[PDB]
Design an enzyme around this catalytic site. Structure first.
Site, short mmCIF file in Angstrom:
data_model
loop_
_atom_site.label_atom_id
_atom_site.label_comp_id
_atom_site.label_asym_id
_atom_site.label_seq_id
_atom_site.Cartn_x
_atom_site.Cartn_y
_atom_site.Cartn_z
N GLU A 137 0.94 -0.78 -0.26
CA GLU A 137 -0.45 -0.04 -0.18
C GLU A 137 0.73 1.10 0.44
OE1 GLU A 137 -2.79 0.45 -0.53
OE2 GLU A 137 -4.20 -1.53 -0.64
N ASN A 161 -7.73 9.92 -5.67
CA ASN A 161 -8.21 9.07 -7.36
C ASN A 161 -9.43 9.52 -7.99
OD1 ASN A 161 -7.84 6.04 -5.62
ND2 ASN A 161 -8.85 7.11 -4.13
N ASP A 219 -13.34 8.69 -8.27
CA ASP A 219 -14.64 9.11 -7.75
C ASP A 219 -13.82 10.55 -6.59
OD1 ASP A 219 -12.79 7.88 -6.36
OD2 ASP A 219 -14.44 6.99 -4.71
N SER A 263 -11.76 10.83 -4.44
CA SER A 263 -11.25 10.34 -3.29
C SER A 263 -10.01 10.38 -3.01
CB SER A 263 -12.26 9.09 -2.45
OG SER A 263 -11.60 8.21 -3.20
N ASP A 273 -6.80 7.88 -0.97
CA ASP A 273 -5.93 7.08 -0.03
C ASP A 273 -4.45 7.55 1.55
OD1 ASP A 273 -7.74 5.07 -1.16
OD2 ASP A 273 -6.04 5.39 -3.00
N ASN A 291 -8.80 4.84 2.43
CA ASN A 291 -10.09 5.86 2.25
C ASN A 291 -10.82 7.02 2.06
OD1 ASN A 291 -13.19 6.18 -0.68
ND2 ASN A 291 -10.21 6.47 -1.29
#
Ligand code: NA
Length: 129
Positions: free
Chosen positions: A35, A46, A49, A51, A53, A60
């Site tokens: 990750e 992202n 959408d 969003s 991380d 998220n």
């Protein structure tokens, strides 16, 4: 802060992650490695959408933390996403436990991709955990 491998395993163990809801330390380590590379300052936007991380576990914004800029998002861990970008990972850890509370570590696609059904032992070898 970029954690060294064994340093992180001991830190995770002290924070109560070893075998948390059936998840071994080796699995958590495999997750954090893929990750963020053990990097608490990691962020990933992202575009699709809207969003982002955040942190070492790349949690998220749509569901777990609040950053004030993700449309119709919620804050299940009840913390500012900023909290997930600090050197001390206690908050990220408490939020990671909530993410997996519902139904497991398979919550992260990356874990299914490079950790599920793989030889993960290497991630804690010689760390004394
Ligand atoms: Na949110």
């Amino acid at each position: 802060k970029v954690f060294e491998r064994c340093e992180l395993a001991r830190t995770l163990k002290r924070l109560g992650m070893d075998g948390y809801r059936g998840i071994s330390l080796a699995n958590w380590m495999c997750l954090a490695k893929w990750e963020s590379g053990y990097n608490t300052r990691a962020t990933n936007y992202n575009a699709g959408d809207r969003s982002t991380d955040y942190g070492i576990f790349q949690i998220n914004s749509r569901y777990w933390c609040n950053d004030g800029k993700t449309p119709g998002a919620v804050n299940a861990c009840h913390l500012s996403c900023s909290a997930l970008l600090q050197d001390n990972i206690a908050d990220a850890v408490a939020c990671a436990k909530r993410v997996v509370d519902p139904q497991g570590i398979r919550a992260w696609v990356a874990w299914r991709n490079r950790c599920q059904n793989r030889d993960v032992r290497q991630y804690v070898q010689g760390c004394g955990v």
